[PDB]
Amino acid sequence: SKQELDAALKKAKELASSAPVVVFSKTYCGYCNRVKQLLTQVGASYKVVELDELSDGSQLQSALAHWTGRGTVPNVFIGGKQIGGCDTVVEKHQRNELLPLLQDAAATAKTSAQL
Amino acid sequence: DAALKKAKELASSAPVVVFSKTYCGYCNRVKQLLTQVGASYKVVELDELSDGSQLQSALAHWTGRGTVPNVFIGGKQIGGCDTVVEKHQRNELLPLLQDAA
Amino acid sequence: SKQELDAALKKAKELASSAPVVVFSKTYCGYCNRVKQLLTQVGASYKVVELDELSDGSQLQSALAHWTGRGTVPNVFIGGKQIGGCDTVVEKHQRNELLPLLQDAAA
Amino acid sequence: KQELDAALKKAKELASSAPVVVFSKTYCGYCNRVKQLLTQVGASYKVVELDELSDGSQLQSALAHWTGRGTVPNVFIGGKQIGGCDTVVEKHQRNELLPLLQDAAATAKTS
Ligand SMILES: N[C@@H](CCC(=O)N[C@@H](CS)C(=O)NCC(=O)O)C(=O)O
Ligand SMILES: N[C@@H](CCC(=O)N[C@@H](CS)C(=O)NCC(=O)O)C(=O)O
Ligand SMILES: N[C@@H](CCC(=O)N[C@@H](CS)C(=O)NCC(=O)O)C(=O)O
Ligand SMILES: N[C@@H](CCC(=O)N[C@@H](CS)C(=O)NCC(=O)O)C(=O)O
Numbered sequence: 001s002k003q004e005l006d007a008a009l010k011k012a013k014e015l016a017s018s019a020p021v022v023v024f025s026k027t028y029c030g031y032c033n034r035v036k037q038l039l040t041q042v043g044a045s046y047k048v049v050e051l052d053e054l055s056d057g058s059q060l061q062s063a064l065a066h067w068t069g070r071g072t073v074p075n076v077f078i079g080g081k082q083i084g085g086c087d088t089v090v091e092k093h094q095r096n097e098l099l100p101l102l103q104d105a106a107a108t109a110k111t112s113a114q115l
Numbered sequence: 116d117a118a119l120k121k122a123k124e125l126a127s128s129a130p131v132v133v134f135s136k137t138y139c140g141y142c143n144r145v146k147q148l149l150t151q152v153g154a155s156y157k158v159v160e161l162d163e164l165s166d167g168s169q170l171q172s173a174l175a176h177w178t179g180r181g182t183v184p185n186v187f188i189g190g191k192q193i194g195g196c197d198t199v200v201e202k203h204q205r206n207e208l209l210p211l212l213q214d215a216a
Numbered sequence: 217s218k219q220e221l222d223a224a225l226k227k228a229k230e231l232a233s234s235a236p237v238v239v240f241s242k243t244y245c246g247y248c249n250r251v252k253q254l255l256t257q258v259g260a261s262y263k264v265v266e267l268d269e270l271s272d273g274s275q276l277q278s279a280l281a282h283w284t285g286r287g288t289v290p291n292v293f294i295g296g297k298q299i300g301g302c303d304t305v306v307e308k309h310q311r312n313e314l315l316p317l318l319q320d321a322a323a
Numbered sequence: 324k325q326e327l328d329a330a331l332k333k334a335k336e337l338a339s340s341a342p343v344v345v346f347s348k349t350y351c352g353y354c355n356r357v358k359q360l361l362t363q364v365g366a367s368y369k370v371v372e373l374d375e376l377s378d379g380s381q382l383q384s385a386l387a388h389w390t391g392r393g394t395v396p397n398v399f400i401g402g403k404q405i406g407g408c409d410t411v412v413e414k415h416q417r418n419e420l421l422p423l424l425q426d427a428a429a430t431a432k433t434s
């Protein structure tokens with residue numbers, strides 16, 4: 001469990017930074033679909049990690065719980081930074097804060113320093 | 116951190132501690148099971164607390180479980196509804212409870 | 217097996233009218249919980265049917281889809297009349313239309 | 324009662340308006356998956372994005388009354404009901420999908 005708890009945490013962290021936007025999700029969840037709706041509405045591209053379609057989904061989820069303090073889906077990352085869940089994303093949209101998050105993350109990622 | 120301290124204190128404040136939400140069917144199931152078998156337990160309903168989401172987040176950080184119920188016996192992490200139900204079917208729950216009492 | 221579907225429709229109709237407020241639900245669903253929480257906070261009493269806990273749950277949902285136009289959960293009935301899902305109840309309540317319905321399923 | 328009868332009629336018309344019709348929502352992962360699969364196997368398909376239509380909700384509700392399916396995608400081949408993303412994917416795994424598409428391709432319009 002030890003070298004394998006480190007493994008799952010390692011894998012979750014990689015996934016979380018693996019795309020400009022990353023949504024940890026379950027295929028059956030409407031809260032997850034609402035986040036997807038809000039991202040699509042703002043014209044963002046994003047990666048979805050459906051945890052229930054992964055054999056290590058369970059372990060990835062508890063790694064996310066330990067790391068982020070959010071053990072529920074959706075668990076949203078923008079530019080590798082923890083955003084929050086569905087309530088969070090709805091709030092960012094409602095206050096017009098979702099677009100700047102996306103654009104600021106993209107600006108940071110564009111043509112980064114080699115050193 | 117404040118929430119992490121409160122959560123740990125809470126989890127140890129009785130022989131059995133169930134972190135819960137009033138609307139949760141899985142919490143109801145554990146609660147029903149625990150009282151069937153005659154156990155006394157403390158319940159902390161997170162949805163009735165101002166700091167409830169911080170407390171839940173502390174529990175995720177500490178236990179790796181981000182959902183309710185989150186069940187403790189003798190200050191030790193047991194798990195959720197499924198964990199408790201399935202232990203009890205395979206006779207592992209009454210020992211633990213008796214030991215903690 | 218249109219008769220597993222007639223049986224499910226029958227069982228569904230009986231369920232829906234078995235209490236003044238009925239919530240077809242799944243135990244794990246946050247949208248279902250949002251409705252349960254709201255009904256409790258307004259002081260209503262409800263019965264819940266957790267479809268994920270029944271062996272004929274999927275058949276009841278098709279029945280509900282065929283019958284009501286809604287195959288998703290939550291599916292909320294007041295006084296035996298289909299009201300809608302989480303969004304509907306929350307919007308109705310925000311327009312003070314939820315309370316009158318709840319009162320009549322008592323009065 | 325007049326409104327319910329019309330939306331059912333429109334649903335049924337759209338369902339048969341192309342050799343393959345996918346009732347969809349733009350953000351839905353199952354819809355994305357079903358569209359990628361149909362593309363993969365060379366299907367000619369028309370997508371109806373319910374969230375892009377003001378009567379999307381009534382259309383979805385018509386689809387549920389009629390098909391008993393309350394979710395997107397809702398897929399039709401040759402005017403006939405197939406089901407959702409899981410159903411189409413299972414057809415494909417059974418190699419039943421290409422033959423259904425070839426059947427529907429016998430004539431340009433659905434008979
Ligand atoms: N407040 C959270 C609620 C998220 C939530 O309740 N997620 C549920 C599903 S609807 C969940 O993850 N349950 C455990 C699981 O499905 O793994 C948010 O806004 O994202
Ligand atoms: N498999 C879990 C299911 C628990 C679960 O899904 N709980 C829901 C409440 S119904 C939850 O905590 N959802 C996220 C939330 O309410 O914050 C267990 O056996 O305990
Ligand atoms: N707009 C609906 C959302 C309902 C929804 O998306 N429900 C999901 C679960 S969180 C569902 O029933 N999915 C299909 C299924 O479980 O069979 C509402 O407001 O109630
Ligand atoms: N098992 C179904 C699942 C489809 C599904 O869950 N769709 C979600 C959208 S991603 C849905 O329709 N939710 C209710 C709604 O959008 O009204 C299939 O394979 O097609």
Ligand code: FES
Binds near residue numbers: 028029246248
């Ligand atoms: S499941 Fe229904 S909301 Fe997550």
